[PDB]
Design a protein around this ligand. Structure first.
Ligand code: BGC
Ligand code: BGC
Ligand code: BGC
Lengths: 123, 123, 124
């Protein structure tokens, strides 16, 4: 069991870790659109989707892996009208074989975020 | 690592796989009430719930397993006033030992779906 | 594979088990704020958060583990204004290394619960 932590990803203040590695499996925390250096949400849905992917990418790298190792991705959106935009931006972060995934429209997200995503990595 | 694809489940169009098998653990994508041949949602809640289970069943069979191997299932409903019905129909697809599960009321689901479910299977 | 059942956790009514242990990994069902003895929800947000943690703890103990073995926790709240209180109460139930977690605002929860949480445990 390993705590995965990178200062390239937003600081984890509170009782949780950016990710926990257990055996070959890395359980990554939900990432919201926080700019790590300012700890404020970036403005705009495309920038927020992109920031969540950058944050998850930073954690995956700290775990000695990459998006190629992601087996499952959960997508949480306050507005599913933006789901096609998530699909589009993913083309810039993923390629075959793609992760399994779930996507739901939620009522609200921490800090007023429009998008949050978590994932499971298998090294 | 292995990509799981059932030609009986709805086609995965876009950046995801129906399921990803990593060792003995199969991470299955969320399934919505899509009729695989028409790629349109079936009508009415009972039909939708049933279609989701049928879709997950196809993916489970493609993974070389069955509902008996599912260890966790997530239920996403736009209206929990439909929970009695998900429970009833679920009882008809699973038997002891029953899987672990979570259930939440969401604001919305892809394509205006009334229900979405994902699962984890262990061979 | 093993069914985990704690008689200190709310009875599982329906087609589910409180938790399933497969190998070294335990997949735990979402717990809501039910008082196991009355099957009624405890009242007040702090009590509800505490009861869900107590319910997961009971289930974790029956799986041969504890909160130290939790690698991922999912928090579902109908009102995220209650997130700070979840954080505070959670700090009393966990110690470093802390688990990974996700937290979302949902439209509704079973039985009118204000909070629900599920978790994954990896036993040594
Ligand atoms: O507000 C920051 C929060 O964002 C969530 O996505 C993180 O995963 C939580 O653990 C954290 O408390
Ligand atoms: O609209 C179809 C969508 O439904 C979800 O349940 C699938 O698993 C997603 O990967 C897919 O994009
Ligand atoms: O009302 C109790 C319900 O609470 C959920 O969080 C459990 O995980 C469900 O399986 C159960 O039906």
């Amino acid at each position: 069991k390993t705590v995965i932590t990178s200062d390239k990803a937003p600081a984890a203040i509170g009782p949780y870790s950016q990710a926990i590695k257990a055996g070959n499996t890395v359980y990554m925390s939900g990432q919201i659109p926080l700019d790590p250096s300012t700890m404020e949400l970036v403005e705009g849905i495309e920038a927020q989707i992109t920031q969540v992917f950058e944050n998850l990418k930073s954690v995956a790298q700290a775990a000695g892996g990459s998006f190629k190792d992601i087996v499952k991705l959960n997508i949480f959106l306050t507005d599913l009208g933006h789901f096609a935009k998530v699909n589009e931006i993913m083309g810039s972060y993923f390629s075959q074989p793609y992760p399994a995934r779930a996507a739901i429209g939620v009522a609200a997200l921490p800090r007023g975020a429009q998008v949050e995503m978590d994932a499971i990595l298998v090294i």
